[PDB]
Amino acid sequence: SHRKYEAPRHGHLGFLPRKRAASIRARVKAFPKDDRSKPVALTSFLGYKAGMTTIVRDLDRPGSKFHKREVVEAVTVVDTPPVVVVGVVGYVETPRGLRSLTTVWAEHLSDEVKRRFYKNWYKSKKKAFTKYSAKYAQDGAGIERELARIKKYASVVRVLVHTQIRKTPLAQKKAHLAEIQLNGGSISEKVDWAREHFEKTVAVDSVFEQNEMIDAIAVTKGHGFEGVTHRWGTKKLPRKTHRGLRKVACIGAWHPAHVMWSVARAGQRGYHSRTSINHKIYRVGKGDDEANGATSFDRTKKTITPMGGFVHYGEIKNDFIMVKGCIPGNRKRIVTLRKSLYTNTSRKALEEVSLKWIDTASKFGKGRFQTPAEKHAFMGTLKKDL
Amino acid sequence: ANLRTQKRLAASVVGVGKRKVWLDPNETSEIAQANSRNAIRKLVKNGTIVKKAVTVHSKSRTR
Amino acid sequence: LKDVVTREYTINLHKRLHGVSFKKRAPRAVKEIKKFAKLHMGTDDVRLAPELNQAIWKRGVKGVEYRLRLRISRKRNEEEDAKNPLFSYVEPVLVASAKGLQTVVVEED
Amino acid sequence: ARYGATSTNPAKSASARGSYLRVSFKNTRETAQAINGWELTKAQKYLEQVLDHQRAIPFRRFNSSIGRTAQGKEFGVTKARWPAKSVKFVQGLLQNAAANAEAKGLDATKLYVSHIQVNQAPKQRRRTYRAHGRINKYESSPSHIELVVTEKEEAVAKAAEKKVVRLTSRQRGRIAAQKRIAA
RNA sequence: GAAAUUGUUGAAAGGGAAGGGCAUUUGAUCAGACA
RNA sequence: CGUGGAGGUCAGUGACGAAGCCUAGACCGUAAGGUCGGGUCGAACGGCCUCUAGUGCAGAUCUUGGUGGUAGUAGCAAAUAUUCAAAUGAGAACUUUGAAGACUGAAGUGGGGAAAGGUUCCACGUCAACAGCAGUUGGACGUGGGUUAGUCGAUCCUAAGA
RNA sequence: GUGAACAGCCUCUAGUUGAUAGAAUAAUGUAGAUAAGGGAAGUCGGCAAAAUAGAUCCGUAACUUCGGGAUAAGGAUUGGC
């Protein structure tokens, strides 16, 4: 008859269907535009999300009432050991869109990837790639011509890398394998890069740097079957209502005589693909560096790992990426950090941060202490100890 | 094997509630033959069936 | 094959009973233990000593101790031949405190 | 006797029945079908595993609003169940068929279940009381069960017709020519 | 010892009903008539 | 055209198989229907002229009986609560005994009665049905046993009333 | 026993431990609870809920049929030894 009062609908029709994703590893739907004048480099990177903590830094933002004043900011830490290059895949343009014509693979593959190619490793004969590997024997003949073929054709080149999940506190042995588009040089320079890097290893610093705006592609946490109130942000029906009240009262007018695609309904919540953008890098840490979590201004030798270690994760003994604020996905989940699709000129983006302090107290309770040393200093000797 | 009867019989004979007649599980074959109050009386007299003590309700905290 | 062993374990009933409804806590503990026996001795046949029952229920349904010290004995079976030749008998061990002990073999004689 | 349609050497078969059994007709129908044509020895081990919840019985007709289980994958099915009482009656008749086979002197190694059919015994009536003073029927659906075990026999040889060939004047002349021409 | 309704066996069809009309292909099946 | 009975007739059919029933086999009729074969079956039945009527079903929220899809679905969620082991038994979550954990909490889930029921009491046997799982258990099933008065009641008396 | 108490709660004697069971703990429920800051803005309407409460002492208004209104209102106190 006409609402009565006007109000915005609940939730965003451009994130439908609200189904579980087809995979834990969210897909990269787009890579940065290519500029073949720059050197060849990855355009993204895998890691695992470790946890969060707090930061302190002076703000640089003329005209803001917090110009030149400290702010405290939340940040996430994603564990980021070097990635290892094991293949190259060459795509070609067609009136039906991008098609892959060949994949060339490294000759040796770590059991870490090989494991990915299996559903029952322990029982299996692990024959994966054992004939492929033999292709190298014959001087190189058939590998060169696939390489040759990628060069002759190919509108784009992506490289095949995987994670070193064993350098990670996780229990799940089976590594993550993925295509990252290469963006420097000529197509031919790209595959040269690719061949050169087989079995060899690549580091975040070769792909990201401080103060850069990056995006994160990941599968959202899971919540299983959710009713309408919390899944769509629908208003609780009144207390008096029969037949329950976390619902939608009217599921549609009489005509169309069909429930419509655009009304809220109970069903799965979370475990969605998301592509979240513009997360500034606050730290590019290095695994082989005590004072990881130390600062120009702090100075105390200590790493990012909180007392007792990241809750529900472990320790971080690898390079990491420290990103302002929060990111889709949970602790332990694979996560693609991606290069921005545009040069952002925001001033907010552009600002060059310098951490003055990284929180490092336990997250398993009300952390009172940054280090075991500080905690000894304050408590003195206890009944154990010396 | 079904000592229900002999237990009721036991309660009545001793003067106590069934909640307190003990029918000894290693003399079940002998107990089962005790159809009569005379045979339960003998079964009580020699310890095949015992009275089982009251549950104390001490008054010591009252006192 | 067979094997016939006795060892003494301490089972963490606390993390196994975490969350369980108050009127299932001592009942869960019976099942939980049984399950704990099979996992170690590989045996589907687990009998609990009546004393172990008492130990378990010593404080009523919802008051199970956080840690029991158990003795588990893999024994061979006799009579009307069962599905499996082996079975475990679980017993309480009179220890002052079930806190701080590690799993231990008991020499057979 | 007088079982359903069978197509089988009775000299090489044995058989068994239970009439009026108080098992669910629908559940034991699905479990009979789960066994139909099985090597006798394979089938027996199979029912044993059903009872152990290690494999399931696929429910293919009497199955709407049944649950789902990974144990239906091997049968290409998502709904499958574990009908204890059904399984035990069937293996009862099954074990009987075995005995009868031993009696006849049939090789127990070749036995497959070649016929297995359940259908509906007369229902048995009980009643339940419903709101507002009403009565409803509360009924059993018993089953008749019958099966036949047969010694499996290989081969079959050939032999049949010869197809009498009939062709016109113009048709046998071309033929006469095909030879007169070539080979 | 019918029908509704059911099990098994055999044969066939089945991209949001089924069933029906006129016509023919294909399969299966069968009467007659030749002398 | 078809049905139940009746008069006549065909010296009609039939235990060497009447009637009936089944049958994407045959044939006659525009059709109502009629005829055959085969299977099943078991004691009676049909053609023609004619007589007669309780004489033809898809319906009537028709009558009585039977049967489906619904569906192995709704459900079997009030009354705090169950556990270990032995014994018995083809079979034990559910029977018996032991142990333990609890409950009712003397305004009782204790110990008796009035009305009502009528054998349910008790013993031995025992599970086809019944006790909306089970069952070796039962207020079930089978077979037996059992209710003792000068003093307890009735009986006597009178009440409203009959 | 507590206590004003034949209340509630715990217990002795007696009697039960009967009420299909197993596994998980999605939505939505039924029944039981809690919520920062605000405080009826919700709603036909404070519906529901929350607040109050025992006892000892202090102290209690309009009005009145002089009996009341009145536990008016409003306060303090309360264990153990």
Ligand SMILES: [Mg+2]
């Ligand atoms: Mg408008």
Ligand SMILES: [Mg+2]
């Ligand atoms: Mg899928």
Ligand SMILES: [Mg+2]
């Ligand atoms: Mg190719």
Ligand SMILES: [Mg+2]
């Ligand atoms: Mg919720």
Ligand SMILES: [Mg+2]
């Ligand atoms: Mg909202």
Ligand SMILES: [Mg+2]
């Ligand atoms: Mg939200």
Ligand SMILES: [Mg+2]
């Ligand atoms: Mg209402």
Ligand SMILES: [Mg+2]
């Ligand atoms: Mg709503």
Ligand SMILES: [Mg+2]
């Ligand atoms: Mg914390």
Ligand SMILES: [Mg+2]
């Ligand atoms: Mg919980």
Ligand SMILES: [Mg+2]
């Ligand atoms: Mg029959």
Ligand SMILES: [Mg+2]
């Ligand atoms: Mg059906």
Ligand SMILES: [Mg+2]
């Ligand atoms: Mg169905």
Ligand SMILES: [Mg+2]
């Ligand atoms: Mg279902």
Ligand SMILES: [Mg+2]
């Ligand atoms: Mg459905």
Ligand SMILES: [Mg+2]
């Ligand atoms: Mg299916």
